[PDB]
């Protein structure tokens, strides 16, 4: 079966926490996090990827820069575009700018993406355990989420269907001794290391798709 807990940060698949600042680009941070773990799995090298590359160039795939977007449209762009640059070559400035995509600076590629059956937390558990970090959307429009600090986050006002924020599941686990209760998803956010728990949040797991975490999960195929 599947492991009782997984934490890809402990295996070198995850870069330090980033900060999207005042730009609606969480979708891009989620998409680069997932691509960063897959390229690492494939090559053994961890390289920070460019969210800016995505914000500036994927309008054709249906993204809207700092006005919003979707992780699947971003993997679609890296595939149609044939590549994606590093952060070091195409830095993040948090505003919509001129597409400056440079093929010679590409450090990642993907042939498309795989989707996790919507609403299926156990399908998600399976993808996290066998693939690596997974891009997911959640409902983060809540004061308790803005002010989150520690523990398992559970917010009654959360929706599993109306989502507004893209994040990355880097693993899952539980608190205590019974591996079957008090479970949580380990999630990397893009509001800087200062938000939450060093930039992460534990979201209640197997509690009816809390905050929509398994409503729209996907990962790139490299």
């Amino acid at each position: 079966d599947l492991p009782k807990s997984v934490d890809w940060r402990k295996k070198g698949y995850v870069t330090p926490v980033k900060n999207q600042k005042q730009c609606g680009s969480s979708w891009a941070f989620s998409a680069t996090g997932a691509l960063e773990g897959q390229m690492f799995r494939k090559t053994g090298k961890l390289v920070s990827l460019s969210e800016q590359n995505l914000v500036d160039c994927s309008r054709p795939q249906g993204n809207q820069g700092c006005n919003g977007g979707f992780m699947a449209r971003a993997f679609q762009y890296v595939k149609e575009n044939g590549g994606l640059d590093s952060e070091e070559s195409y830095p993040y400035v948090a505003v919509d700018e001129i597409c400056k995509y440079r093929p010679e600076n590409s450090v990642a590629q993907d042939t498309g993406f795989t989707v996790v059956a919507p609403g299926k937390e156990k399908a998600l558990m399976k993808a996290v355990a066998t693939v690596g970090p997974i891009s997911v959307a959640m409902d983060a429009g809540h004061s308790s989420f803005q002010f989150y600090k520690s523990g398992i986050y559970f917010e009654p006002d959360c929706s599993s269907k109306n989502l507004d924020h893209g994040v990355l599941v880097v693993g899952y686990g539980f608190e205590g001794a019974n591996s079957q209760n008090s479970k949580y998803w380990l999630v990397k956010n893009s509001w800087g290391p200062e938000w939450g728990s060093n930039g992460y949040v534990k979201i209640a797991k197997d509690k009816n798709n809390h905050c929509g975490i398994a409503t729209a999960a996907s990962y790139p195929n490299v």
């Binding site: 999207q20 005042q22 730009c23 609606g24 969480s26 983060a140 429009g141 803005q146 507004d164 924020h165 509001w191 800087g192 938000w195």
Partner: peptide
């Protein structure tokens, strides 16, 4: 979503 954006940080407050």
């Amino acid at each position: 979503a954006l940080a407050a």
